[PDB]
Amino acid sequence: WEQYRDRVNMLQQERIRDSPLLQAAKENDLRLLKILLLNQSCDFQQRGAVGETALHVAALYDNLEAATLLMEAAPELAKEPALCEPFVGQTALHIAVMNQNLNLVRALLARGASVSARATGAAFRRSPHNLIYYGEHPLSFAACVGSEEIVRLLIEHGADIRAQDSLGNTVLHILILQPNKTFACQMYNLLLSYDEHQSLELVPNHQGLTPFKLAGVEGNTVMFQHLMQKRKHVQWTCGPLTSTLYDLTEIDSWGEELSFLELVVSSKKREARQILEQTPVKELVSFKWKKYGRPYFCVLASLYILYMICFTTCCIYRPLKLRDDNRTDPRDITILQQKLLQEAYVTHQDNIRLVGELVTVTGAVIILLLEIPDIFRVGASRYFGQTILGGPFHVIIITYASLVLLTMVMRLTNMNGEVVPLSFALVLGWCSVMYFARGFQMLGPFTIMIQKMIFGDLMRFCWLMAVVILGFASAFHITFQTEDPNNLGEFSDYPTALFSTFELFLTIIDGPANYSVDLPFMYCITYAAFAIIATLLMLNLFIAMMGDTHWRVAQERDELWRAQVVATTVMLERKMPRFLWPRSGICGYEYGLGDRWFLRVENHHDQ
């Protein structure tokens, strides 16, 4: 593990401490080095425990004048890579570029080291184990550290820009993925020009992303705003206001299945959620929502509630029969039972609701056969991804469909006790209509706030409430097991005591007492202790937690509405048929331009 890295590092340092010749590199004493160079017995192939050469340590501890004599020992020394596990092999260039000393790199290129050699060690690949990521070429190091006078010097001696890597990242993806973008942006601009003398941009990696889409998904707005300016074309400017027109061949991504908007909304990182507030995408999504999305969404919502009221009104009329035998005991109340199937349908009044039952079962099967082919396309863990996409409103629909499908099978075989699935479906169907609050201006924050409140806060709190009610439940049960149950009906057996003390915890039911009899002695002090340890403070603390959760979400509603807006738009455009949705933008073919799509916008900004 990391303890293995510990061990190999200290082993490397003690093996450096061992041998005197390679010690004289880091010691940097010229006289001992000249004496050792005088001897024949002093080899030139001494090697550390990790794969090493004398040139490596001399370049590592920043001694150029101590290395220029070892240049004249043998020119072989610049060509042997390491041979070990953690560092699979690195030449002297990989160490020498990162220290930026120009003279040592000039000496190594004068001797004739390999201009390009790939190095794939355990400490080089991208992972959260390491601290840096740079790629596997000397040009990648020279670019990303930010020394242009070694970039041009190394591009002069070869090292083509179009060169792939493990995981298939070119130099441009490396430059996009880094921090400190204000210094790397102009260097990106400088680096692109040398190859122009498919272009460099259009080649993807193994995952399937162009660098433009990568800069979209990784969440950096600075160089995105920079990179948009190449596609810009200026129109006339008269007085204060100006007019521009943007190219739209790669933002919309028409012919491709994997679009850009769906890719940028469904991202793990937070900062990508910001980049929808830039202009040439915000104007697009606002136009597409204002012109097409809202009527289709409102029609769909109206149809859904008109389905659900028909389900309720065909549910409430169900056939019943007078009970066979009389109650042979007290402690029971039941006077009707379930009717049998053969005598069920006799009349016209019975005949009407059969149409409603067929409508409900047809709606159930058609809503079942729509979400199940969705999850095979992307993956089960991704479809239940996070709250902006709408997972917890998508699980309840298929659960409702499964229960209302099971109800028919339970009805046909004449089974008693069909009240349970019908009751679960009747509560879930009305609680599931809350998903249609996306499409308004002032309800989306409320539904996302109650979702975050029920899944984030109560589940990490319920344990303390559970143990503090269970203790007093057992106490109140054992104090009342020697009295008449006719006089005080609560705390009779064990589960009724548990349910009653849970109800008494939430101040709903009132405290039981009687004045025609006498109660025992422990009950008063235990009830007073329960009243001042569970009712007063343990509930107000949770209410204060609830208010503090509300305050954090209530600041950024104007930013949080638009993300679920565009997610609803892209999903509804994907599932609906093709003929209803036309294209977007302007067709540039008739106006003299060739086979592209454009958008335009004007601005009052100058003075």
Ligand X SMILES: CCCCCCCC(=O)OC[C@H](COP(=O)(O)O[C@@H]1[C@H](O)[C@H](O)[C@@H](OP(=O)(O)O)[C@H](OP(=O)(O)O)[C@H]1O)OC(=O)CCCCCCC
> Binding site for Ca(2+): what residues are annotated?
510
Residue 17 near ligand X by CB under 6 A: no
Helix axes 557-575, 294-315, angle to 10 degrees: 80
The answer to whether 485 and 330 have CB atoms below 8 angstroms apart is no
Under rule CB under 8 A, residue 131 binds its own copies: yes
With CB under 5 to 8 Å by kind, the binding choice for 467 among its own copies, ligand X, none is its own copies
Choose the one of its own copies, ligand X, none that binds residue 546, judging by a C-beta under 5 to 8 angstroms depending on kind: its own copies
Residue placing its CB nearer to its own copies in the complex, 577 or 592: 592
Q: Binding partner of residue 75 among its own copies, ligand X, none, CB under 5 to 8 Å per kind? A: none
30, containing H or E segment: helix 30-38
* Number of residues lying near its own copies (CB under 8 A): 118
Chain center to CA of 158: 41
Other C-beta atoms within 10 Å of 418: how many? 15
Q: Which amino acid is at 55?
A: L
Complex with its own copies: residue 112 or 511, whichever CB lies closer: 511
Q: Write down the residue that tokens 């162009």 correspond to.
A: 210
Contact between 60 and its own copies per CB under 8 A: yes
Is position 95 an interface residue for its own copies (rule: CB under 8 A)? yes
Number of residues near ligand X (by CB under 6 A):
9
Q: Which residue type sits at 372?
A: I
Interatomic CA distance for residues 339 and 587, integer angstroms: 66
Residues 469, 467: Cα–Cα separation, whole Å: 5
- Tell me the C-alpha to C-alpha distance, in Å, between residue 16 and each of 54, 57, 78, 427, 514: 10, 9, 19, 74, 89
Binding residues: 510
275 and 269 Cβ atoms separated by less than 8 Å: no
Contact segment (CB under 6 A) with ligand X among 52-60, 168-176, 302-310, 452-460 equals 452-460
Site for ligand X, residues 345 to 404, rule: CB under 6 A: 384-387, 391
Residue 526 contacts residue 501 (beta carbons within 8 Å): no
Task: State both tokens at 239.
Answer: 């007085």
Please, what is the minimum distance in Å from the beta carbon of residue 301 to ligand X?
16
Residue list 338-367, contact with its own copies (CB under 8 A): none
Residue recorded with tokens 């003398």: 197
Cβ burial, residue 132 (10 Å; 0-12/13-18/19+): exposed
Site string for ligand X, 400-439 (x = CB under 6 A): ----------------------------------------
Q: How many CA atoms lie within 13 A of 603 on its CB side?
A: 14
The minimum distance between CB 549 and ligand X, in angstroms, equals 9
Q: Between residues 369 and 454, which has the closer beta carbon with respect to its own copies?
A: 454
Q: Answer yes or no whether residue 561 interacts with ligand X by CB under 6 A.
A: no
Structural element, H or E, at residue 242: strand 241-247
Cα–Cα distance, 60 to 69 (Å, whole number) = 16
Closer to its own copies by Cβ: residue 217 or 314: 314
- What's the min distance (Å) between Cβ of 573 and ligand X? 23
Smallest CA-to-CA distance from 300 within 563, 561, 560, 580 is with 580
Task: Check residue 240 for interaction with ligand X (CB under 6 A).
Answer: no
What whole-number distance in Å separates Cα of residue 74 and Cα of residue 375? 63
CA-based end-to-end distance of the chain: 61
How many Cβ atoms sit within 10 Å of the Cβ of residue 423?
12
The least CB distance from residue 86 to its own copies, in Å, is 14
- Tell whether residue 583 is a contact of its own copies (CB under 8 A): no
For residues 470-499, which are near its own copies according to CB under 8 A? 470-472, 474-475, 477-479, 481-484, 487, 489-490, 492, 494, 499
- The residue within the footprint of its own copies, chosen from 467, 577, 582, 595 (CB under 8 A), is 467
Site for its own copies in 514-543 (CB under 8 A): 515-518, 522, 524, 526, 528-529, 531-533, 535-538, 540-541, 543
Q: Rule CB under 8 A: say whether 279 interacts with its own copies.
A: no
Residue 384's binding partner among ligand X, its own copies, none (Cβ under 5 to 8 angstroms by kind) is: ligand X
The amino acid that residue 309 corresponds to is I
Instruction: Residue 294: name its binding partner from ligand X, its own copies, none (Cβ under 5 to 8 Å by kind).
Output: none
CB of 95 to ligand X, least distance (A): 40
Sheet of 233-237: strand order equals 233-237, 241-247, 597-604, 586-587
Q: Is 192 in the site for its own copies (CB under 8 A)?
A: no
In the bound state with its own copies, the residue whose beta carbon lies nearer, of 469 and 570, is 469
Our CB check for ligand X shows the closer of 111 and 557 to be 557
Choices 274-282, 453-461, 586-594, 598-606; region in contact with ligand X by CB under 6 A: 453-461
- How far is 599 from 314, CA to CA, in rounded Å? 51
Measure the CA–CA gap between 202 and 6, rounded to whole angstroms: 42
Q: Does 333 bind its own copies (CB under 8 A)?
A: yes
158 binds ligand X (CB under 6 A): no
Q: Which residues bind ligand X (CB under 6 A)?
A: 384-387, 391, 455-456, 459-460
